Design a protein around this ligand. Sequence first.
Ligand SMILES: O=C1CNc2ccc(C(F)(F)F)cc2N1
Length: 126
Amino acid sequence: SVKSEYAEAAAVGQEAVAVFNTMKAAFQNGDKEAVAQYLARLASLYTRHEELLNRILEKARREGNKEAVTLMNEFTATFQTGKSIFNAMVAAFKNGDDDSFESYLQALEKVTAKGETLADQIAKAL
Ligand SMILES: O=C1CNc2ccc(C(F)(F)F)cc2N1
């Protein structure tokens, strides 16, 4: 069902949170080779999460679940803010700019926190 598809999507989201927290630790420690691999893994996970969220949104639209669609539209908007900040972070890493990186890392933590509140509401709406 769409609800089981959302539980899959949530798990992928949690995998990215885990990898993000490991990547932060490696950045603080100065292990740039590790950070590079974690960023590549995060890009894959976020791509996968987005593909699942889009399928869920489209299914809720086809099902006429207006409340779920409202909440999912808000969430995919928040997701795009994440994506933009993540790209900026990846660029800052490529450029060697640790100041921007640290900033963007903090910014992504805020996006994720707000996203999870919406994420919790979507679960109850589907
Ligand atoms: O592509 C990305 C990159 N990072 C990210 C962090 C938080 C969120 C979230 F807040 F959960 F919506 C989404 C993303 N998507």
